[PDB]
Amino acid sequence: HHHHMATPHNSAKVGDFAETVLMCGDPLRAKLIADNYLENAKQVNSVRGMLGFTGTYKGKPLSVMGHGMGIPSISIYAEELYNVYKVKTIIRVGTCGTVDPNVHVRDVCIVTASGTDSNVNRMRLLGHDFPATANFEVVSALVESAKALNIPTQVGKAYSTDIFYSKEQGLNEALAQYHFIAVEMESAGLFPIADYYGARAGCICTVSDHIITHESATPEERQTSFQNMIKIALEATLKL
Ligand SMILES: Nc1ncnc2c1ncn2[C@@H]1O[C@H](CO)[C@@H](O)[C@H]1O
Ligand SMILES: [Cl-]
Ligand SMILES: [Cl-]
User: Fold this and answer.
1) 92 is in an annotated binding site
2) Active site residue: 26, 162, 195, 209, which one?
3) Contacts of 164 by beta carbon, 8 Å cutoff, 6+ apart
4) Closest CA to 204 of 117, 130, 132, 107
5) 110 Cβ contact list (under 8 Å, min separation 6)
6) Which residues, by Cβ under 5 Å, contact ligand 2, an ion?
7) Are strands 20-24 and 89-98 parallel, antiparallel or unpaired?
8) Nucleoside phosphorylase domain: from which residue to which, for each copy (predicted)?
C-alpha cells in the first residue's frame, strides 16, 4: 500500500497536526503521552517509526510526536512541522543530564536558551554566534504552569551536544562555571527553526543523571519526574 507523503518523513495530511505540538525524543513516549493525556486522539504518522498523534487536551487541539536523537533529527521533523504543517508552537519535552551542583536528579528544568557544539547555527548567521533562544511567552507559560501546580523548577540555559559519549576534557567544568543547568541533544536546533518561521518554541526537561556525582534516577523516579514535567507542559499549552 502507498499513501501520499506530504514530506519525505511524515505521512500525515496537511492539517492533521494541531498548531501546538509537544515533541519528545522517544516515539514510544509520544504514544504514552497520547494514550494517557490526549482525548479525540488519532495516530497521524508512523514513518520511520516516528510516531505522531493529534487530539485535544482539555478541549484544545494538541499534537505529540517523537523527534529522535540529535540536532539533525529534530531539525528535519520541526522544519516540516512549521513549514508544511503550519504549526505555531513546539514545546520539546525532554530528559537531560546536569553538571550544576545545585541541580539534582528528578529536577524539572525550563530552558531559556541553549548552547551547542553543532555548526548549524553558525551556518545560519554568517559564521557568528546565534543564540538558540526560547520564546518568552512559552518560557513564561511553563514557569507559571509549574507555579500553579506547586512543582519546583530550575530555569536557565541548556547545552545541546552532538556527542552523547563525550571525551572532552574541561567541558563539564566550563558548563558548571557558567551555570548551564541541562545537558541534552536537541533544543539548540529547535529554537532557530522556530525563528526562521516566525513561530514559537520552548523546552522543558527532567534530570535523569548527575554527570558529576553519577547519581541516576531509578525507573520509578523517572516516571514520577515525567508525570510532573508533562503536566506542566500540557497546562502551559492552554496559555499558548
Ligand atoms: N546526559 C545526557 N547527555 C546528553 N543527552 C541526554 C542526556 N540525558 C538525556 N539526554 C537526552 O536523551 C537522549 C540521549 O539519551 C537525547 O535525545 C538527549 O536530548
Ligand atoms: Cl526518506
Ligand atoms: Cl515515559
Assistant:
1) yes
2) 209
3) 69, 185
4) 107
5) 139, 142, 143, 146, 153, 154, 155, 156, 202, 203, 204
6) 8
7) parallel
8) 21-231
Residue 158's DSSP bridge partners are: 114, 182
| Interval between CA 8 and ligand 2 midpoint (Å) | 5
Cell of 80: 516540516
Strand partners, 43: 53
- What is the DSSP secondary-structure string of 56-120? EETTEEEEEEE--SSHHHHHHHHHHHHHTS---EEEEEEEEEE--TT--TT-EEEEEEEEES-ST
Q: What is the resolution of this structure in A?
A: 1.2
To which CATH superfamily is domain 20-237 assigned?
Answer: Nucleoside phosphorylase domain (3.40.50.1580)
Known binder of ligand: residue 106?
no
Domain locations along the chain: 20-237
Residue tagged 540555559 (cell numbers): 157
- Long-range contacts for 45-49 (Cβ within 8 Å, ≥24 apart)? 45/10, 45/11, 45/12, 46/11, 47/5, 47/9, 47/10, 47/11, 48/9
Of the bound ligands, which one is closest to the alpha carbon of residue 25? Answer: 1
Q: What is the CA 110 to chain-centroid distance, rounded?
A: 10
- How was this structure determined? It was done by X-ray
Q: State in Å, rounded, how far the first CA of the chain is from the last one.
A: 38
